[PDB]
Amino acid sequence: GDFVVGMVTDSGDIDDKSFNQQVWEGISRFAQENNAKCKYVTASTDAEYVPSLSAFADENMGLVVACGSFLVEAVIETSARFPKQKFLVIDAVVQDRDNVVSAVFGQNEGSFLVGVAAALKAKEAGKSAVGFIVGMELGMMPLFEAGFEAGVKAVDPDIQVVVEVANTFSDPQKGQALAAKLYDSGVNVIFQVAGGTGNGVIKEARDRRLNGQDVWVIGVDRDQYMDGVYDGSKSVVLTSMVKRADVAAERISKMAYDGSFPGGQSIMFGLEDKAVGIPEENPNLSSAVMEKIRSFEEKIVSKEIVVPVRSARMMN
Numbered sequence: 001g002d003f004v005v006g007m008v009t010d011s012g013d014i015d016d017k018s019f020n021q022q023v024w025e026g027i028s029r030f031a032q033e034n035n036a037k038c039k040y041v042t043a044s045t046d047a048e049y050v051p052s053l054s055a056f057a058d059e060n061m062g063l064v065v066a067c068g069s070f071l072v073e074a075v076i077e078t079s080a081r082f083p084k085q086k087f088l089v090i091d092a093v094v095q096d097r098d099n100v101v102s103a104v105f106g107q108n109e110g111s112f113l114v115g116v117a118a119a120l121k122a123k124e125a126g127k128s129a130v131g132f133i134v135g136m137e138l139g140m141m142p143l144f145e146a147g148f149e150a151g152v153k154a155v156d157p158d159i160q161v162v163v164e165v166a167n168t169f170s171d172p173q174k175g176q177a178l179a180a181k182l183y184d185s186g187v188n189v190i191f192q193v194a195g196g197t198g199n200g201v202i203k204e205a206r207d208r209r210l211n212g213q214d215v216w217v218i219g220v221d222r223d224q225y226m227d228g229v230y231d232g233s234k235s236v237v238l239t240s241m242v243k244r245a246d247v248a249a250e251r252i253s254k255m256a257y258d259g260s261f262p263g264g265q266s267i268m269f270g271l272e273d274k275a276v277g278i279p280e281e282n283p284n285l286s287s288a289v290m291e292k293i294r295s296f297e298e299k300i301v302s303k304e305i306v307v308p309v310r311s312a313r314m315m316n
């Protein structure tokens, strides 16, 4: 009865205020605007990955969307079994499948920009360390730390980045504990790249500011400024590393619907497509800080500066 897009995620939550929420929102917009339909399913454990993709393929969906590095192995296999079914992989790469499109993001380039903002706010308070909390480090996740460190060092090579890994994208309690550990050490800015877990990092920052501690958090995926309002007016969110997975999902769903699915291609959504970067409006960033950030953004887009894909501590 309708062209249908089906989303399979490893997360039990599409309202994570971040990544899964952006993907579902993009699929939802495509459906609403094109008189089509959509649905999703959660694959909590990997024993569910293959059967979940298979069921959708068995219903002859217009497009099957798989989110994240965890589902890659299952997509690689399943796409070969259903050569006529179109699949879209977000946040990972699949090769040798003419029925699969891989959407990847230049998140190292966008993270460079919030690294500049972080280093400037830290210097403002005489701090020589900033924090970074990441959900997991598999797949393309290391790009966030690589770019964040690069942006911080571009401002002041002496500022250290202190890293904490949660090893989960769905545990806010853990996010809060790791944020408390970093803030208790004297850090005043933390960039969180942790999906649902990250909501706990934002909560901890809100609680600290409420009681007079001059701390900040940088959000991810969505513009999380409102998520950080703690006293009715002010927000603890300095800025956010926005990642338009919604645009990717919506646009590729439309290509599938129209017959122009770019099967077998990896499409990079980067800083020049405005697919990653910071929000257009930033109440907590001064015009001077904004100028510095846009200056760097221009050099990255022109390739005058190339942002690494792995941080110093992860390189030989």
Ligand SMILES: O=c1[nH]cnc2c1ncn2[C@@H]1O[C@H](CO)[C@@H](O)[C@H]1O
Binding pocket: 010, 011, 018, 019, 020, 067, 068, 069, 091, 135, 169, 193, 194, 195, 196, 220, 221, 243
């Ligand atoms: O549930 C998830 N499954 C896989 N990856 C995720 C999930 N949530 C978040 N990310 C990854 O972490 C980054 C920051 O939130 C997201 O951009 C995405 O790359």
